[PDB]
From a paper:
Instead, we found that CENP-I from another fungi C. thermophilum (ct) is 62% identical in sequence to thCENP-I, and showed excellent biochemical behavior. Due to the high degree of sequence similarity, we tested whether ctCENP-I could form a hybrid complex with thCENP-H/K for crystallization. It has been shown that the N-terminal region of hsCENP-I is necessary and sufficient for interacting with hsCENP-H/K. We therefore purified the corresponding N-terminal region of ctCENP-I (ctCENP-INT), which indeed formed a stable hybrid complex with the thCENP-H/K proteins. We first determined the structure of ctCENP-INT at 2.3Å with the Single-wavelength Anomalous Dispersion (SAD) method. ctCENP-INT adopts the HEAT repeat fold containing five pairs of helixes α1–α10. A following helix α11 folds back and packs against the HEAT repeat with extensive hydrophobic interactions, which likely contributes to the protein stability. The structure of ctCENP-I is similar to a model of hsCENP-I proposed previously, except that helix α11 packs on the surface of the HEAT repeat in our structure. The structure of ctCENP-INT in the complex is very similar to the apo state.
Residue numbers in the entry: 8 to 197, 205 to 227
Write the structure that this text describes.
């Protein structure tokens, strides 16, 4: 069922709502209801990540609703992860900062379902260089705290985040990430604890994941 729903949304997303022959709203609600009930398979997650990150004519409310119901029924592939990472930052190809925040939050919430979580370590710089962008900083810090390994904690990165903390006047999410850096190099001098951003989402994701056994 799901592939036909995505088919319809993807074709409607190429057309301004003014010019569509039928409104897309009922198919959005069918998709989001199906996502909530069954989650999405790895192939469907790629298709969904495409309409979430490409520039198209879907409205922001529908895009947020899909993201909030983007429950993986199985695992999350490297291609999906890299689609969301490629959508981060400033650019004519890129989605709103508000959506980027939800993508980053989602990445934290499905971290244990990534097929190769180490792939985030290979794009560490993309994530780290965006810490200036205050609109996504809390979600960046949380994701970076999960991804940071010793090899990422290079002196230039230690200083940039010390400089950013000073210049912003202190920021508890930057302080949290600095404490992760501190775990590796305790000579760094340094209040956010990065708990799960949505325990309800976790419980419902777990219920969907329960069916795999």
């Amino acid at each position: 069922g799901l592939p036909r729903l995505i088919d319809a949304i993807e074709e409607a997303s190429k057309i301004p709502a003014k010019r569509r022959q039928t409104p897309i709203k009922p198919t959005i609600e069918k998709l989001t209801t199906h996502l909530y009930t069954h989650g999405a398979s790895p192939d469907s997650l790629l298709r969904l990540a495409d309409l979430l990150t490409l520039r198209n004519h879907l409205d922001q409310a529908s895009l947020a609703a899909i993201t909030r119901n983007l429950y993986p029924s199985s695992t999350v592939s490297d291609e999906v992860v890299l689609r969301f990472i490629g959508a981060l930052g400033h650019g004519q190809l890129k989605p709103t900062l508000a959506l980027q925040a939800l993508f980053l939050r989602w990445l934290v919430m499905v971290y244990h379902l990534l097929e190769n979580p180490g792939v985030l370590g290979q794009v560490y710089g993309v994530l780290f260089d965006l810490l200036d962008t205050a609109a996504i900083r809390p979600q960046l810090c949380h994701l970076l705290a999960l991804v940071t390994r010793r090899k990422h904690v290079r002196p230039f990165r230690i200083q940039a985040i010390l400089t950013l903390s000073r210049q912003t006047g202190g920021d508890p999410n930057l302080t949290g990430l600095l404490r992760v850096f501190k775990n590796y190099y305790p000579e760094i001098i340094v209040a956010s604890a990065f708990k799960h951003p949505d325990p309800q989402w976790r419980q419902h994701l777990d219920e969907i994941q329960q069916r795999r056994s």
